[PDB]
Amino acid sequence: GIEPLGPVDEDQGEHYLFAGG
């Protein structure tokens, strides 16, 4: 994820917009 806030995105180093499950 590339967003500045949200659940952390290991793959792009920033944050997902949302995550679930």
PDB file of N, CA, C and O in Angstrom:
ATOM      1  N   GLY A   1       0.796  -1.228   0.000  1.00  0.00           N
ATOM      2  CA  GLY A   1       0.000   0.000   0.000  1.00  0.00           C
ATOM      3  C   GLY A   1       0.827   1.276   0.000  1.00  0.00           C
ATOM      4  O   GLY A   1       1.917   1.335   0.558  1.00  0.00           O
ATOM      5  N   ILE A   2       0.258   2.291  -0.680  1.00  0.00           N
ATOM      6  CA  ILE A   2       0.933   3.565  -0.886  1.00  0.00           C
ATOM      7  C   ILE A   2       0.300   4.740  -0.124  1.00  0.00           C
ATOM      8  O   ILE A   2       0.793   5.867  -0.230  1.00  0.00           O
ATOM      9  N   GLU A   3      -0.802   4.499   0.583  1.00  0.00           N
ATOM     10  CA  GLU A   3      -1.499   5.571   1.304  1.00  0.00           C
ATOM     11  C   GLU A   3      -0.705   5.986   2.531  1.00  0.00           C
ATOM     12  O   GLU A   3       0.034   5.188   3.100  1.00  0.00           O
ATOM     13  N   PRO A   4      -0.913   7.225   3.005  1.00  0.00           N
ATOM     14  CA  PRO A   4      -0.156   7.701   4.172  1.00  0.00           C
ATOM     15  C   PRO A   4      -0.681   7.228   5.516  1.00  0.00           C
ATOM     16  O   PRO A   4      -0.005   7.428   6.522  1.00  0.00           O
ATOM     17  N   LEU A   5      -1.879   6.657   5.569  1.00  0.00           N
ATOM     18  CA  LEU A   5      -2.483   6.136   6.817  1.00  0.00           C
ATOM     19  C   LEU A   5      -3.264   4.872   6.454  1.00  0.00           C
ATOM     20  O   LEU A   5      -3.743   4.730   5.312  1.00  0.00           O
ATOM     21  N   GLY A   6      -3.427   3.998   7.419  1.00  0.00           N
ATOM     22  CA  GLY A   6      -4.193   2.778   7.246  1.00  0.00           C
ATOM     23  C   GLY A   6      -3.396   1.597   7.737  1.00  0.00           C
ATOM     24  O   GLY A   6      -2.273   1.721   8.237  1.00  0.00           O
ATOM     25  N   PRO A   7      -3.932   0.393   7.584  1.00  0.00           N
ATOM     26  CA  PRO A   7      -3.172  -0.805   7.903  1.00  0.00           C
ATOM     27  C   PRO A   7      -1.873  -0.806   7.096  1.00  0.00           C
ATOM     28  O   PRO A   7      -1.897  -0.488   5.906  1.00  0.00           O
ATOM     29  N   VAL A   8      -0.748  -1.157   7.708  1.00  0.00           N
ATOM     30  CA  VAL A   8       0.528  -1.022   7.028  1.00  0.00           C
ATOM     31  C   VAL A   8       0.651  -2.005   5.862  1.00  0.00           C
ATOM     32  O   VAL A   8       0.234  -3.181   5.944  1.00  0.00           O
ATOM     33  N   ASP A   9       1.247  -1.515   4.781  1.00  0.00           N
ATOM     34  CA  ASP A   9       1.457  -2.257   3.550  1.00  0.00           C
ATOM     35  C   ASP A   9       2.936  -2.598   3.424  1.00  0.00           C
ATOM     36  O   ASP A   9       3.756  -1.733   3.095  1.00  0.00           O
ATOM     37  N   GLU A  10       3.277  -3.854   3.735  1.00  0.00           N
ATOM     38  CA  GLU A  10       4.678  -4.283   3.651  1.00  0.00           C
ATOM     39  C   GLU A  10       5.244  -4.182   2.239  1.00  0.00           C
ATOM     40  O   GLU A  10       6.439  -3.992   2.087  1.00  0.00           O
ATOM     41  N   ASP A  11       4.389  -4.366   1.248  1.00  0.00           N
ATOM     42  CA  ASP A  11       4.824  -4.525  -0.121  1.00  0.00           C
ATOM     43  C   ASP A  11       5.215  -3.237  -0.822  1.00  0.00           C
ATOM     44  O   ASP A  11       6.122  -3.251  -1.648  1.00  0.00           O
ATOM     45  N   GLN A  12       4.568  -2.123  -0.503  1.00  0.00           N
ATOM     46  CA  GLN A  12       4.969  -0.808  -1.016  1.00  0.00           C
ATOM     47  C   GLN A  12       5.490   0.134   0.070  1.00  0.00           C
ATOM     48  O   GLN A  12       5.944   1.254  -0.236  1.00  0.00           O
ATOM     49  N   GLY A  13       5.467  -0.286   1.327  1.00  0.00           N
ATOM     50  CA  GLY A  13       6.141   0.441   2.373  1.00  0.00           C
ATOM     51  C   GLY A  13       5.390   1.574   3.031  1.00  0.00           C
ATOM     52  O   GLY A  13       5.972   2.271   3.857  1.00  0.00           O
ATOM     53  N   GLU A  14       4.108   1.756   2.701  1.00  0.00           N
ATOM     54  CA  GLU A  14       3.270   2.746   3.359  1.00  0.00           C
ATOM     55  C   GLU A  14       2.039   2.022   3.913  1.00  0.00           C
ATOM     56  O   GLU A  14       2.227   1.132   4.767  1.00  0.00           O
ATOM     57  N   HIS A  15       0.841   2.386   3.505  1.00  0.00           N
ATOM     58  CA  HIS A  15      -0.377   1.876   4.124  1.00  0.00           C
ATOM     59  C   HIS A  15      -1.410   1.518   3.068  1.00  0.00           C
ATOM     60  O   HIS A  15      -1.475   2.155   2.017  1.00  0.00           O
ATOM     61  N   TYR A  16      -2.204   0.486   3.343  1.00  0.00           N
ATOM     62  CA  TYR A  16      -3.415   0.216   2.595  1.00  0.00           C
ATOM     63  C   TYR A  16      -4.494   1.239   2.912  1.00  0.00           C
ATOM     64  O   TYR A  16      -4.570   1.747   4.036  1.00  0.00           O
ATOM     65  N   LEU A  17      -5.399   1.473   1.969  1.00  0.00           N
ATOM     66  CA  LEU A  17      -6.598   2.224   2.270  1.00  0.00           C
ATOM     67  C   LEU A  17      -7.455   1.465   3.305  1.00  0.00           C
ATOM     68  O   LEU A  17      -8.031   2.067   4.207  1.00  0.00           O
ATOM     69  N   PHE A  18      -7.575   0.143   3.138  1.00  0.00           N
ATOM     70  CA  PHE A  18      -8.344  -0.669   4.057  1.00  0.00           C
ATOM     71  C   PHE A  18      -7.814  -2.091   3.996  1.00  0.00           C
ATOM     72  O   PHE A  18      -7.163  -2.503   3.032  1.00  0.00           O
ATOM     73  N   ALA A  19      -8.155  -2.851   5.036  1.00  0.00           N
ATOM     74  CA  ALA A  19      -7.843  -4.276   5.063  1.00  0.00           C
ATOM     75  C   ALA A  19      -8.911  -4.974   5.874  1.00  0.00           C
ATOM     76  O   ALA A  19      -9.553  -4.362   6.737  1.00  0.00           O
ATOM     77  N   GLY A  20      -9.098  -6.261   5.582  1.00  0.00           N
ATOM     78  CA  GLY A  20     -10.187  -6.996   6.156  1.00  0.00           C
ATOM     79  C   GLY A  20      -9.893  -8.448   6.347  1.00  0.00           C
ATOM     80  O   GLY A  20      -8.950  -9.006   5.779  1.00  0.00           O
ATOM     81  N   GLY A  21     -10.780  -9.077   7.107  1.00  0.00           N
ATOM     82  CA  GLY A  21     -10.503 -10.414   7.578  1.00  0.00           C
ATOM     83  C   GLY A  21      -9.386 -10.471   8.603  1.00  0.00           C
ATOM     84  O   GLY A  21      -9.055 -11.628   8.998  1.00  0.00           O
TER      85      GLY A  21
END
